[PDB]
Design a protein around this ligand. Structure first.
Ligand SMILES: [Cl-]
Ligand SMILES: [Cl-]
Ligand SMILES: [Mg+2]
Ligand SMILES: [Mg+2]
Ligand SMILES: [Mg+2]
Ligand SMILES: [Mg+2]
Ligand SMILES: [Mg+2]
Ligand SMILES: [Mg+2]
Lengths: 6, 236, 236, 6
């Protein structure tokens, strides 16, 4: 749901 | 600094204990102390550093967004004037966030980046640089927002250029960097197409390289490729 | 203190925003500033205070236990000497924990408790007093461990005596207090029987009073009664 | 699993 970053 | 008297190894050990204790502020301060020993960081240490700050700043970012949404709600027609508190406290959280980002950027600038000659280190730190300018961009609203964005962009771009030249398309750092740079495009640079093209191409180039990997490298890469796909699914 | 210049109402408002932002350290500092305004706390404010610190100290306690277990493992036969770090860092976390507990105890002693004349406030603060001595007891190992325990005990006992005299057996504060005092018995005072008798009796007396309650009071009480039962199930 | 306090 929240875009992913890493 | 505060960590000037502790052995580098002890800071690293403590950083690892803080991580176990989920004490990320402590982890971060330990890692900052370790960085400030002046020695290059090993891969593990760079990840400790990154984990520590990502977690710290991730808590501040999540808080900031909570407060930001509250604040935006108090700014809607029919909203009851509640005074300066929401803005004040968002600003407090925002300031603390900016100070973490400034601290990381400061560690990168003094002197992680300039000493990082291997692709894995240099890309990693440039990604981190992009990320922390990106976090600054997320809260930026002033005359410096464009330059902050540009700094995020420039760091990510240099990291992308090196990663592309020096790392396989499945490299988890290359993938994570592309993932974040894609998020930067989507949500900071207002370039959702670029964000999507980047995540697509990155995913597809990594896909085509998976065959070269051991099972454990495969798992590392596909883990990140999945985050690319999650964004693509979110964004398309 | 740091919060000396902020309006009491603004501290409370900010405490509520920090709670929303899950910024419990901030919540706690705001509530401490509010307490330090010198005015009694309303029910809501006392709960804000309690929520803030419980969360702060709960993070430190969870960290301390992680570090404690690590440390205990490094103290087992065949464990490789890793130096002082684990102990040092447990001690750092422990010290910070003790300082939060000391701060809460200090707010209670100056001057929450002495001004709290209503059962709901006085029991609540005495429970809090028991709780924070209990948290201190959890990490205590020195000559003061017995006295710390005794202080937890004495606070809980006075809270129990008032709660029993002044509150219905379903009162959530009475129930929470009994729950914690039961945990105090079980895990601090080495009196698992007393812990079990207390939780049993408390649960059963509350059960017999549920009929007096509105649906919302029923839900508040049964919520706590369930925690009593969870302990009883755990302990029996 | 952890005993409850509130
Ligand atoms: Cl503030
Ligand atoms: Cl330490
Ligand atoms: Mg040295
Ligand atoms: Mg109105
Ligand atoms: Mg298009
Ligand atoms: Mg005033
Ligand atoms: Mg050995
Ligand atoms: Mg028995």
């Amino acid at each position: 749901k929240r875009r992913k970053s890493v | 600094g505060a960590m000037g008297s502790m052995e580098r190894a002890s800071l690293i050990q403590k950083a690892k204990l803080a991580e176990q204790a989920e004490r990320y502020e402590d982890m971060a301060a330990f890692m900052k102390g370790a960085v400030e020993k002046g020695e290059e960081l090993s891969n593990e240490e760079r990840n400790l550093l990154s984990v520590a700050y990502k977690n710290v700043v991730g808590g501040q970012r999540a808080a900031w967004r909570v407060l930001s949404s509250i604040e935006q709600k108090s700014n809607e027609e029919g909203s009851e004037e509640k005074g300066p508190e929401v803005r004040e406290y968002r600003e407090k959280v925002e300031t603390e966030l900016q100070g973490v980002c400034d601290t990381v950027l400061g560690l990168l600038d003094s002197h992680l980046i300039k000493e990082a000659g291997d692709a894995e280190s240099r890309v990693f730190y440039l990604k981190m640089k992009g990320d922390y300018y990106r976090y600054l961009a997320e809260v930026a609203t002033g005359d410096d927002k464009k330059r902050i964005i540009d700094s995020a962009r420039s760091a990510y771009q240099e990291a992308m250029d090196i990663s592309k030249k020096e790392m396989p398309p499945t490299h988890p750092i290359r993938l994570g960097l592309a993932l974040n740079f894609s998020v930067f495009h989507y949500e900071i640079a207002n370039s959702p197409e670029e964000a999507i093209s980047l995540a697509k191409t990155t995913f597809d180039e990594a896909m085509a390289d998976l065959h070269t990997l051991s099972e454990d490298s495969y798992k590392d890469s596909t883990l990140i490729m999945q985050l690319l796909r999650d964004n693509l699914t979110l964004w398309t």
